[PDB]
Ligand binder design. Structure first.
Ligand SMILES: N[C@@H](CCC(=O)N[C@@H](CS)C(=O)NCC(=O)O)C(=O)O
Length: 209
């Protein structure tokens, strides 16, 4: 296979790029790094920023989850139709990343004490994406333009993990709710999301969700 994903046995920051690969009919190798392998230290020391995911496209070695997403978007035609749409795709992805960072901070550093405030603040964090959908073909296609982009897969993952954290959090957002249902039903993505490869991994690395 042309691609290799090097990561812990977690959905985490690889869920969106895996959904992209599966939905686009791509083949890839999963190199699963156990915690004991990670703690041995040698792989970590060889990683550019000391972290995973690590990704290979042939001999091209990449780090940074959003770099991997942008690489796949650029090379597979999932980055809008022109330069203006490319910028809007980036604007969406950067917004997704900001909220993912807040989610990660809650999960790994403050779940017990922070969850109630986080969930009560979540409608204002999700509203921008409903607004974006409302401005693009009435929310009936994708987050930018009329074709899927890497930002759709990242936004879809962000929405799915927040549905687990806070069931019903999309109920006030009809376009986001329909968008999740529509994209999740795409045949290859639907089959992947139902597969043990996905279902039998935890969302995060610390048992919380
Ligand atoms: N900004 C980086 C974040 C990388 C990151 O957080 N890696 C975590 C797994 S999600 C990790 O490797 N933790 C082990 C460590 O830092 O020693 C990205 O988007 O890829």
């Amino acid at each position: 296979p042309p691609y290799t994903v090097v990561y812990f046995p977690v959905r985490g920051r690889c869920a969106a790029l895996r959904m992209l690969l599966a939905d686009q009919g791509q083949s890839w190798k999963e190199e699963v790094v156990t915690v004991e392998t990670w703690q041995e230290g040698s792989l970590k020391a060889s990683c550019l920023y000391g972290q995973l995911p690590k990704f290979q496209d042939g001999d091209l070695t990449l780090y940074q989850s959003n770099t991997i997403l942008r690489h796949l978007g650029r090379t597979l035609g999932l980055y809008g139709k022109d330069q203006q749409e490319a910028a809007l795709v980036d604007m969406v992805n950067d917004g997704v990343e900001d909220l993912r960072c807040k989610y990660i901070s809650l999960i790994y550093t403050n779940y017990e004490a922070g969850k109630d405030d986080y969930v009560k603040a979540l409608p204002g964090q999700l509203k921008p994406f409903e607004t974006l959908l409302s401005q693009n073909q009435g929310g009936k296609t994708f987050i930018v333009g009329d074709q899927i982009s890497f930002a759709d897969y990242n936004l879809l993952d962000l929405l799915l993990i927040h549905e687990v954290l806070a069931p019903g959090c999309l109920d006030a957002f009809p376009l986001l709710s329909a968008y999740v249902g529509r994209l999740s039903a795409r045949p290859k993505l639907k089959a992947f999301l139902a597969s043990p490869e996905y279902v039998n991994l935890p969302i995060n690395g610390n048992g919380k969700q």
